[PDB]
Amino acid sequence: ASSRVIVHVDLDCFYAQVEMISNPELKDKPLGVQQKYLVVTCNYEARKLGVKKLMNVRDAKEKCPQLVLVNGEDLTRYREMSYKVTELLEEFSPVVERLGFDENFVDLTEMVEKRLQQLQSDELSAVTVSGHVYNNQSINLLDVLHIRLLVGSQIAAEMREAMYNQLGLTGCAGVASNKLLAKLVSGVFKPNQQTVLLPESCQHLIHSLNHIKEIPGIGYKTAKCLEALGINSVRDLQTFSPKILEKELGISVAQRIQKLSFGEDNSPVILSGPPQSFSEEDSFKKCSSEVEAKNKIEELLASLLNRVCQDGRKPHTVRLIIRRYSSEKHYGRESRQCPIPSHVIQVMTPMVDILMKLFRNMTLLSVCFCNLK
Amino acid sequence: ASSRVIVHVDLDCFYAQVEMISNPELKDKPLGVQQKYLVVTCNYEARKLGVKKLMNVRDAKEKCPQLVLVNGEDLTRYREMSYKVTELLEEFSPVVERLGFDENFVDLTEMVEKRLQQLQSDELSAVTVSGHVYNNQSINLLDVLHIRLLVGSQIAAEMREAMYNQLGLTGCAGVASNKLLAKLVSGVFKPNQQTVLLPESCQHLIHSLNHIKEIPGIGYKTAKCLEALGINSVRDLQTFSPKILEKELGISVAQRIQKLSFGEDNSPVILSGPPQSFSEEDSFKKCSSEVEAKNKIEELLASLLNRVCQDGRKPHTVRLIIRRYSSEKHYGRESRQCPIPSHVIQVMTPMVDILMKLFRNMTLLSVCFCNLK
DNA sequence: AGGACCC
DNA sequence: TAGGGTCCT
DNA sequence: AGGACCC
DNA sequence: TAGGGTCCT
């Protein structure tokens, strides 16, 4: 119960794929998917012309006039397709973990060992890789770890083939020995490809990063703090004092990210299962009067109500969120959670009023249904 | 799936019982159990002479010179006996809920209906009560609810008989139609007795309370707020405006306690199962220098380590708590939680140092092990 | 993390 | 006010 | 409730 | 910086 074979699956310009399947006349034309004043993602044709993900509509059109834009504010179809992807991967090995709507981790460890046991002592000398080998590293067929990771790259290919045959979707996969590594190496060959990481090339991968923010687990905030201390490269963090970090991010944040800086990550692939929340949201820049915008609240509800129904499980808690108009404190959301009366769990009319009392205890609005059962 | 038969079991001067069993020469002498400068509880002989629970050692001895005191700082034996009680009740009906070390709720609803189905149409006219009937109310053998509650009082008696035969312990029980009511009515006949509440006497029970703090669910804080608004009696709260309360405690706190004021409570009996935490603690009045008292921290650890072991399940998180020396802000604890490295989950020497870094990020000290699996 | 509630 | 312990925001 | 992290 | 979503303190 030590070495693992993990796969990280990450789809190509996800929203844009879904749009392109829904409207075929959009293929081979450069496409962006817009959400308010943001081109949240664009297809590969668009990326060729300079359009970057998360670019404002102004810079996307003055970097590419030639640019088709569809609105992706309503995540319904992306959500449905997201679950069809995860369910398919569930069929290969039941323990699948989602990250966002288009990334899935799967622990292939038991499956690999089952395929290996099936192989007589002979054809195993013919075990080949499927896809790229990170850093063009050589394979050693006598190395049991190389063998498992190559069998791991074959499961990956089959997964990708299925995703395409069954759902029409393309994507990348990366096979490695932990979650961190698999995710980092799934991006090396970007458009519709897969890469596998042999142990000997772990340090090469980790050091190919240019900023420690590029490590999954280190975000906007810990990154800024790491800098204030002179830690900029992955090596800086590697070599930085445990005690000084221990004592400035907390032993938790610190002993963990330091492991990450070496490529070490023991966190298991967890079964995501059904969602732990359903929320809808809406932006508008200081468009909220201050109760001419309960109407906004009835919209979000109409939608959600229907959704949360579909699943079967009912939420036992409601939440409203907000934010207010100023000089780039951006960071600031507020909420009031409240339990959902046992009576209404089986419609609109009373819901509205709960959220409203909740409003009163209190740039943009949203409603979460959590604690599902 | 509507009406329920719930039992609330509450032992007599619990700590003192356990002590009296351990040292027989202490029976029939007035006994208190001391924790620092507090007589946390005393036997019935002591209560006859004016000793009240939670009375300071000074007032207990100048209200009763004649007074034997043993130290109850170490809860080990009370804890063991607490679980033997719950386990025994588990044998009657698996869903048992604990409250504190000496109170247990059990939903007798399925058991009652099973006993009733066994009875031919005939002996059911001979169904009698076991114990007191709250308010001396009359029984109506044709009332299906009276019948179920009386069968409920018989299960209660059997429980009490078992607790006594099997563990040597005495206690009270109350049978009612919800948790609130069962708990309220278990105390009416105080020393080693049981009481059953018929529906017709619900309002009588609820109105026999003198302060709304006496309602389970309303504590020191909500009580003080309820007063600031003129709400003193259970009737005041009954009749108080939903909107004005709704808006001053929150819809959650408010719509719930208002139900409680009528005797209405739908909360189900939940299976407590194994504990969700193990902690040890220690007081000392500004006895902590400010690192001459890491030694205090190694004590608590020696103990806990052993405990948390016994169960099997290992904690995945540690926590330290503190409080500081002043003018009756009493209320104020601080803590730093931290995850427990996967390595040490299988000893002392590194633990100490985690808690210590945790100390540094930071009248009395304590250590919790939570998140067990 | 801290609040509120219970024994 | 001891020494615990639980669930919520 | 709010923080931090991720897509 | 959209519109979501997860786990921790």
Ligand SMILES: Cc1cn([C@H]2C[C@H](O)[C@@H](COP(=O)(O)OP(=O)(O)OP(=O)(O)O)O2)c(=O)[nH]c1=O
């Ligand atoms: C990162 C990010 C993604 N998304 C949406 C848009 C993406 O289509 C989708 C997935 O995120 P990504 O996988 O990072 O983006 P991508 O799949 O579109 O592009 P790539 O081919 O390079 O993998 O989720 C956002 O709405 N906001 C965000 O901040």
Ligand SMILES: Cc1cn([C@H]2C[C@H](O)[C@@H](COP(=O)(O)OP(=O)(O)OP(=O)(O)O)O2)c(=O)[nH]c1=O
């Ligand atoms: C309420 C309370 C109880 N306890 C301990 C002492 C008690 O023996 C035990 C149980 O609480 P209780 O049941 O309230 O007290 P009791 O069982 O001792 O007395 P009674 O016969 O009237 O039911 O837990 C405390 O340590 N602190 C507290 O604040």
Ligand SMILES: [Mg+2]
């Ligand atoms: Mg991605």
Ligand SMILES: [Mg+2]
């Ligand atoms: Mg992607």
Ligand SMILES: [Mg+2]
């Ligand atoms: Mg009690």
Ligand SMILES: [Mg+2]
């Ligand atoms: Mg008791």
